Scaffold this active site. Structure first.
Site, PDB file in Angstrom:
ATOM      1  N   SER A   1       0.928  10.912 -12.086  1.00  0.00           N
ATOM      2  CA  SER A   1      -0.057  11.189 -13.145  1.00  0.00           C
ATOM      3  C   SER A   1      -0.537  12.654 -12.974  1.00  0.00           C
ATOM      4  O   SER A   1       0.271  13.571 -12.696  1.00  0.00           O
ATOM      5  CB  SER A   1      -1.194  10.112 -12.999  1.00  0.00           C
TER       6      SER A   1
ATOM      7  N   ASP B   1       3.340   5.004 -21.861  1.00  0.00           N
ATOM      8  CA  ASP B   1       3.316   4.021 -20.770  1.00  0.00           C
ATOM      9  C   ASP B   1       1.937   3.407 -20.611  1.00  0.00           C
ATOM     10  O   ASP B   1       1.610   2.875 -19.552  1.00  0.00           O
ATOM     11  CB  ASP B   1       3.729   4.661 -19.463  1.00  0.00           C
TER      12      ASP B   1
ATOM     13  N   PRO C   1       0.723  -5.671 -11.323  1.00  0.00           N
ATOM     14  CA  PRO C   1       1.954  -6.362 -10.889  1.00  0.00           C
ATOM     15  C   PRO C   1       3.059  -6.197 -11.941  1.00  0.00           C
ATOM     16  O   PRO C   1       2.752  -6.029 -13.108  1.00  0.00           O
ATOM     17  CB  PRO C   1       1.517  -7.837 -10.782  1.00  0.00           C
TER      18      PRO C   1
ATOM     19  N   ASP D   1       4.959   0.471 -16.700  1.00  0.00           N
ATOM     20  CA  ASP D   1       3.727   1.101 -17.166  1.00  0.00           C
ATOM     21  C   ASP D   1       3.034   2.055 -16.156  1.00  0.00           C
ATOM     22  O   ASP D   1       3.443   2.138 -14.979  1.00  0.00           O
ATOM     23  CB  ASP D   1       2.814   0.094 -17.897  1.00  0.00           C
ATOM     24  N   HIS D   2       2.033   2.797 -16.605  1.00  0.00           N
ATOM     25  CA  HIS D   2       1.351   3.777 -15.762  1.00  0.00           C
ATOM     26  C   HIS D   2       0.814   3.269 -14.394  1.00  0.00           C
ATOM     27  O   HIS D   2       1.035   3.897 -13.379  1.00  0.00           O
ATOM     28  CB  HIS D   2       0.226   4.413 -16.567  1.00  0.00           C
TER      29      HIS D   2
HETATM   30 CA   LIG Z   1       2.393  -5.685 -15.546  1.00  0.00          CA
END
Ligand SMILES: [Ca+2]
Ligand SMILES: [Zn+2]
Length: 381
Positions: free
Chosen positions: A109, A313, A362, A353-354
């Site tokens: 990030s 994301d 998770p 995702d981010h």
């Molecule tokens: Ca997830």
């Protein structure tokens, strides 16, 4: 070819190995990424720096944590922005750096912009700080002298190299502190509780901001919202926006003596009628409900924000991740099985995702351990 240890560097959330009751930013609910890299024989350290501070302030802190010493933000920079010149004092994780040691940075990030700026300061210093020093007869941090190249290669994960449109949300202020709240929750930490231990130190010494006895995070964040670390140009908030990232790109260039690697992330699907992008199933709840709608549908012709930018994301536009473009002269080339020096090696885009990518959220199909071991191996190659 190499022996370099790896230094992990978080983004606009992030905390030390003892903060958050041991819940790791690197590995979150999945585990402890540092431990895995060490078990596997790749020597790894974790930096902790102000999550909301500018990349400059963050790079200065990083320098201090690495080599040891007292944080020096530069007397020209602290005078211009109205904050302390010196910050906290560090032992140094890598004293070998003083005798020609080298490192690799794995940055998530905003950590990627910081890692870039660190490299560019180490190599080139700051002309502005050198001159303010001679001109007002004060001391200069060796960080500003230039000629100190010690980062061998920089790897960025889901970094907003060109900014993220999240910042343009009408309620960006309340929603961004809601995200600090979410990342807290995922560590079993309440925002309505006045904890007595630090838990999450925002490292705002320089602004003289610190959480108070009997102050919950809800209350702390309200104050932060109204402080110069949210409202000044010397903020994560500013370097994160599109115009802010482009400004950083104008002076923060790829060093020819570093290898750069970029990883993009996505967790959306395109809608055929609207051309908007929407959160896939399993995307972290907060980004799913609060951020991804907006990111997948916000266009702005004046900012040159069109359909390219909508894929995301959950926090950063995917188009922003492969390397700086806006206001930049860096080159980006796609990975060809070899890591080239002086340019961005685009390692492609992962359907993660981010927060899944650092394991804070998770994702059972994401093999986070093999992911990080492969990165480690590539850096050694
Ligand atoms: Ca997830
Ligand atoms: Zn500053």
């Amino acid at each position: 070819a190499n022996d370099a240890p790896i230094v992990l560097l978080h983004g606009f959330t992030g905390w030390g190995r003892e903060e958050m009751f041991g819940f790791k930013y690197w590995g979150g609910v999945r585990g402890d990424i540092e431990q895995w890299l060490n078990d596997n024989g790749y020597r790894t350290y974790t930096l902790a720096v102000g999550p909301l501070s500018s990349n400059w302030d963050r790079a200065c802190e990083a320098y201090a944590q690495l080599v040891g010493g007292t944080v020096d933000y530069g007397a020209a920079h602290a005078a211009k922005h109205g904050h302390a010149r010196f910050g906290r004092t560090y032992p140094g994780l890598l004293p070998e750096l003083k005798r020609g040691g080298r490192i690799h940075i794995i940055a998530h990030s905003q950590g990627g912009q910081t890692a870039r700026m660190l490299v560019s300061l180490l190599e080139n210093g700051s002309q502005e700080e050198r001159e303010y020093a001679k001109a007002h007869n004060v001391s200069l941090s060796p960080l500003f002298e230039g000629g100190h190249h010690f980062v061998l290669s920089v790897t960025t994960i889901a970094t907003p190299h060109d900014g993220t449109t999240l910042v343009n949300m009408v309620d960006f202020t309340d929603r961004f502190f809601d995200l600090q709240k979410a990342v807290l929750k995922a560590a079993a930490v309440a925002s309505n509780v006045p904890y007595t231990s630090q838990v999450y130190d925002f490292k705002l010494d320089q602004w003289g901001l610190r959480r108070q006895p009997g102050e919950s995070f809800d209350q702390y964040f309200e104050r932060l919202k109204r402080s110069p670390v949210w409202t000044s140009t010397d903020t994560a908030r500013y370097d994160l926006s599109v115009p802010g990232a482009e400004k950083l790109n104008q002076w923060v260039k790829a060093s020819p003596n570093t290898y750069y690697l970029s990883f993009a992330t996505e967790r959306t699907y395109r809608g055929a009628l609207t051309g908007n992008y929407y959160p896939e199933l399993g995307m972290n709840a907060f980004s799913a409900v609060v951020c991804a709608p907006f990111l997948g549908s916000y266009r702005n012709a004046t900012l040159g924000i069109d359909d390219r930018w909508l894929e995301n994301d959950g926090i950063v536009n995917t188009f922003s991740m492969n390397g700086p473009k806006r206001g930049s002269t860096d080159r980006i080339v796609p990975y060809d099985g070899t890591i080239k020096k002086g340019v961005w090696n685009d390692m492609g885009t992962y359907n993660v995702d981010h927060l899944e990518v650092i394991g804070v959220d998770p994702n059972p199909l994401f093999d986070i351990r093999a992911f990080y071991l492969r990165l480690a191996e590539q850096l050694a190659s």
